[PDB]
Amino acid sequence: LSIKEEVEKELNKKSTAELFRKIKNEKISFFLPFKCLPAQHRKLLFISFVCAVLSGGTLPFFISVFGVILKNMNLGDDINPIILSLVSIGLVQFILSMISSYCMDVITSKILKTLKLEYLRSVFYQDGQFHDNNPGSKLRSDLDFYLEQVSSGIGTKFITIFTYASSFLGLYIWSLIKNARLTLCITCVFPLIYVCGVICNKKVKLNKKTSLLYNNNTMSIIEEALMGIRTVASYCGEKTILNKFNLSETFYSKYILKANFVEALHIGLINGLILVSYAFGFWYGTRIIINSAFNGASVISILLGVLISMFMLTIILPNITEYMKALEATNSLYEIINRKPLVENNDDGETLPNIKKIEFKNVRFHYDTRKDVEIYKDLSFTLKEGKTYAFVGESGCGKSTILKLIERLYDPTEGDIIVNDSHNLKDINLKWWRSKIGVVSQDPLLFSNSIKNNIKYSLYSLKDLEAMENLEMKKEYQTIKDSDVVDVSKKVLIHDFVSSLPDKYDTLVGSNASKLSGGQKQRISIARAIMRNPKILILDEATSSLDNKSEYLVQKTINNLKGNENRITIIIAHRLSTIRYANTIFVLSNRNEGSYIIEQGTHDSLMKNKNGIYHLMINNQKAPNNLRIIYKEIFSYKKDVTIIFFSILVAGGLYPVFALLYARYVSTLFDFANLEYNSNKYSIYILLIAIAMFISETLKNYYNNKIGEKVEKTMKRRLFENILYQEMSFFDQDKNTPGVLSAHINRDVHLLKTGLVNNIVIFSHFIMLFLVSMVMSFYFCPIVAAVLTFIYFINMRVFAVRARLTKSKEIEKKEDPSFLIQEAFYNMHTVINYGLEDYFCNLIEKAIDYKNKGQKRRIIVNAALWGFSQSAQLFINSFAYWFGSFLIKRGTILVDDFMKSLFTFIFTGSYAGKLMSLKGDSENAKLSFEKYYPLMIRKSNIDVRDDGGIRINKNLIKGKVDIKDVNFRYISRPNVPIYKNLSFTCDSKKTTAIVGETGSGKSTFMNLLLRFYDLNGEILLDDINICDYNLRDLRNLFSIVSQEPMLFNMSIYENIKFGREDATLEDVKRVSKFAAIDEFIESLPNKYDTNVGPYGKSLSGGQKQRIAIARALLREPKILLLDEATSSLDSNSEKLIEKTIVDIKDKADKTIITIAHRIASIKRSDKIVVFNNPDRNGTFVQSHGTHDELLSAQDGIYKKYVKLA
């Protein structure tokens, strides 16, 4: 997980007091999911309700007999009746906890089924206008989201709110009736915990948000430097990017450490006030006794009662949050099911006797999103029955929209679509209209069942109009015989192919028919469309891939199909061989704000009508090392490790002492002699232990993160400093992308902070507890500790309950009801056309036949696994006390030894199990580090940091640049040669123009000239080769001006000083005057300090490139490399740029190489070099030294580009 997301998840959470105010003020009841239920499922809720309040009255009994057991063991009498009375309660608790999970998971399954089976329905009755807004794969990306917010908050962890409240009430009020002045004076230290929490969380969030503020800046820097890399190298700006990074990272570090300090203090203080509560409770208890003469067994239990009463309020609250979450998720779904379709199928529309005389009258339409993009102007004409038609439209006319208007996805806005001169479109039953339209769409939309069933899905919507008009719909699909498939396959000439291979009609087509060819799939789609004898045939790019044979045979079929005496066939295709004969062809076009009839006439009187657009149509067409690096790094901080060491030893040493100090107090409380002095002596020790455990935990939890930060901010530096100095072939590979390279630096380095150097400390502290506890529990009473260890071993590692539980839960949570949902939303526009309730009642059967056999076994097992989880510690403690009281009455063991060897074991087990769940991801952080470690130790082999080579002065530079031969070929595609035997010169201080074919690869001379790609060939600068120059000073005399510049998110004054950090503002004012931009900058607030936006998006294209030209002229360049500085800008800036260019070239000081195509610059050019690509193998030079005095002396291309210019 990323850092930004991890902080936003913590910041975007609402407390219960906020969700309640959000949930009350629009009447979202607490009983919303439990209103889709029969009565047979409505009273299992009551059963599971009363089978939970009873299981809460267990702890108020054990806590009431706990002190009496001890008073009875250390005084001489027996305890067997108490045990016999205490085991039966465990048994009935097991049974009452076995009931509830069974009774609840069933209900969850039921409601989770019903919501889905209503959602699918409400989705399948949208009106097209909606489908355009929320298309397809989103809806099943939201469904499975909501259906895992409601199931993880309405299961068995909704009934555990009433058990805990029952236990709360019982404990507290039993503790209050016995003696109130004692329990009141114990729960007065607890408000000080809530107050500290609310005071500290604020100081946490205030600093954490300011930490987040300084993080996205670094993200922007990294992405924006990894994107524009070849403009960072050519100006030698690898260094002045790192200072911003290091200045932006330190604020983040210091503020998040300020947060972690407060986050660590709270823990230590919560672990310190409780131990004071114990001591003051005992001290005041022993003073209400002496003043009385109320036994001592009514002081050992009140403390546990009042102290465990509040532990329930620390675990009730998350479940209420999850329940509110489930509510707001369900009420984010009962608005989708209850949306109005506005094209409703009332099943009452008066239908025609037959379809006759379709007629349009002046229909206009606007979308809902694009409320200003019109397609129609004057749609008005007539289409009569019995005779054929045909139409022709371009790729943006609206054949799709006419289809959606005859199919009636949309309604008209202005006109009307009266049919048969007495019936409007909005009176016909939509069920019956679509029943006589055969659409052959662009792509073949076939399912993944067979070749026969995709064909036989046509007649279902008609056979469904036979039973209701007399249920009988489920079985009458057998009436559809297999003899119609025979002849309808013969007609399209596919019967031979489907009969040639085995499994004639039973062969299953692939996933969306991924076995056959596209043309054959379109043939099957056409056979599907033809099979039902459609009345209004609407083709759309139907016979495109077919040859003339199948097309013309289908045409013969349609125009001679039985029952064509009364039809309106609308055959629409782009191949103009289908329109040889037609009763009328209104060729349709949209020429832009709306279509209209452009032509009219039969094909005999249309191809020769006029010299219009249809004339053009008929005329034209016719591995271990890597981590010991980290362990070397960690063990170089000598002051921060010793404090952690000492604090771990202190905590692990002084926490177990509290147990055997709690047992020396019991034995002196049943001894009326000198009770006062003993209390005075045994309370001060607990005060001291609290004061020590505060400091120990605080300093253990702070220096941990203090160590964790530095490993990050010394690995990020190495990565981001090593990536910049790498050559360009690195960035050209496939798996070396800016996104994946920027994902590592944040995610996996934050994981190295969390995982490793959090999970080391946990294991160390755990072992330090486990050694000493096992030692001084095996020393007082050896016989008991062996038995207790055997018990917990055979429990945790052999009867792992919560492990098997989640292993059975998440597997079925991960999981044909899941294959049809997917392939029903892809093929939506076929079920909207025809076939709608076959899948309304097929998902139900496939869903139900997988419930029972698995669900009932899984749920009768997972309840037996939960009951034994809730009712295990009781039996263990009972057996322990029985065995202790058994060995005592035969002399083998004393009392105090047992009472000291028991409590240590108990409390240390609880505390160890507590802190052992704070771990992170230790595995993936050791796995990623093997991916991204070779990147911080990779060699570059074109390295600018090398200071070995011939130093070069700017004084003795002539400026000649020569090439003798080149043969270049990219490694990302080693088949396309580009250059072949390029050889020419550029002498000194003279212009050299480059004209040639567009896209021939002219912008690669430049890159080789700056050493981005090494070599075959030979390049020369002042008669010396380029690989002997110490390229620091080679890149420090060139200066490019590319087609598109790139600016950064810094000020303008800094973007102009990129590379050269030592230059006054007067030079910037001087050079911005020659770029003709020192008037707009003097019209603005914060003139030379206006922070432009990211990627320079707060400027125009005519202001950006003049800033670039100012950036290129500040370096005092010796060789200038221009590329069409006046391409696609507005008039004023373009003219200013021509003025600057023609001003530079007059000041003959520097050698210049341009890429020009305007004749005004060619004339002054002193040399012109043509590039040509005769055949697709390479380019080379064909002309030399024309300079427009040789404009026509031999036959060539320069004459073209001077008469075209």
CA atoms in the 13 A half-sphere facing the CB of 508: 4
Angle at CA of residue 709, ends 707 and 712, nearest 5°: 120
Under 8 Å between Cβ of 92 and 106:
no
Under 8 Å between Cβ of 857 and 628:
no
| Topology adopted by domain 358-620 | Rossmann fold (3.40.50)
**Residue 175 CB contacts under 8 Å (≥ 6 apart), including other chains:** 183, 301, 302, 305, 306, 309
Q: Is 1181 helix (H, G, I), strand (E, B) or coil?
A: strand
DSSP designation for 623: -
Cα dihedral value 15, 21, 24, 28, nearest 10: -40
Angle at CA of residue 931, ends 928 and 934, nearest 5°: 135
DSSP designation for 351: P
Alpha carbon separation from 933 to 83, 105, 737, 1075 (Å, rounded): 62, 48, 17, 46
Burial of 809 (0-12, 13-18, 19+ CB in 10 A): middle
Beta bridge partners of 962: 985, 1020
1039 residue type, one letter: S
Beta bridge partners of 626: none
Q: Which of 853, 1164, 1170, 878 is nearest to 79 (CA)?
A: 878
DSSP labels, 317-345: HHHHHHHHHHHHHHTTTTTTTT---SS--
How many residues belong to the chain?
1205
Could you give the CA distance from residue 989 to residue 1119 in angstroms, rounded to a whole number?
9
**Residue 793 CB contacts under 8 Å (≥ 6 apart), including other chains:** none
**Residue 1052 CB contacts under 8 Å (≥ 6 apart), including other chains:** 1081, 1088, 1089, 1090, 1092, 1107
Alpha carbon separation from 345 to 125, 126, 429, 599 (Å, rounded): 9, 11, 7, 38
Could you give the CA distance from residue 905 to residue 775 in angstroms, rounded to a whole number?
11
Under 8 Å between Cβ of 189 and 690:
no
Structural domain spans, the chain: 358-620, 960-1037+1118-1127+1144-1205, 1045-1116
Could you list the residues known to form a binding site, using ranges.
367, 369-370, 395, 397-401, 442, 515, 517, 519-520, 970, 973, 998-999, 1001-1004, 1043, 1099-1100, 1102-1103
Under 8 Å between Cβ of 593 and 411:
no
Could you list the residues known to form a binding site for ATP, using ranges.
367, 369-370, 395, 397-401, 442, 515, 517, 519-520, 970, 973, 998-999, 1001-1004, 1043, 1099-1100, 1102-1103
Q: Which CATH class is domain 1045-1116?
A: alpha beta
Whether the domain at 358-620 and the domain at 1045-1116 fall into the same CATH topology: yes
**Residue 792 CB contacts under 8 Å (≥ 6 apart), including other chains:** 909
**Residue 172 CB contacts under 8 Å (≥ 6 apart), including other chains:** 183, 305, 306, 309
Burial of 1028 (0-12, 13-18, 19+ CB in 10 A): exposed
Beta bridge partners of 571: 390
DSSP designation for 1024: E
Could you give the CA distance from residue 449 to residue 32 in angstroms, rounded to a whole number?
40
Q: Which residue has the tokens 């002596």?
A: 681
Could you list the residues known to form a binding site for Mg(2+), using ranges.
442, 1003, 1043
The string over 106-123, giving b where at least 16 C-beta atoms fall within 10 Å of a residue's C-beta and e elsewhere, is: ebbeebbbebbebbbeeb
CATH number of the structural domain 960-1037+1118-1127+1144-1205: 3.40.50.300
User: Which two three-digit tokens encode residue 409?
Assistant: 């996805």
Element (H, E) at 179: none
**Residue 92 CB contacts under 8 Å (≥ 6 apart), including other chains:** none
Could you give the CA distance from residue 159 to residue 719 in angstroms, rounded to a whole number?
51
**Residue 283 CB contacts under 8 Å (≥ 6 apart), including other chains:** 679, 683
Beta bridge partners of 585: 390
Beta bridge partners of 437: 536
Q: Which of 131, 129, 593 is nearest to 373 (CA)?
A: 593
Experimental determination technique: cryo-EM
Q: Is 440 helix (H, G, I), strand (E, B) or coil?
A: strand
Under 8 Å between Cβ of 30 and 154:
no
Give me the resolution in angstroms, 1 decimal: 3.2
DSSP labels, 75-127: TT---HHHHHHHHHHHHHHHHHHHHHHHHHHHHHHHHHHHHHHHHHHHHHT--
Classify 976 in phi/psi space as left (phi over 0), alpha (psi -120 to 50) or beta. beta
526 φ, ψ (degrees, to nearest 5): -65, -40
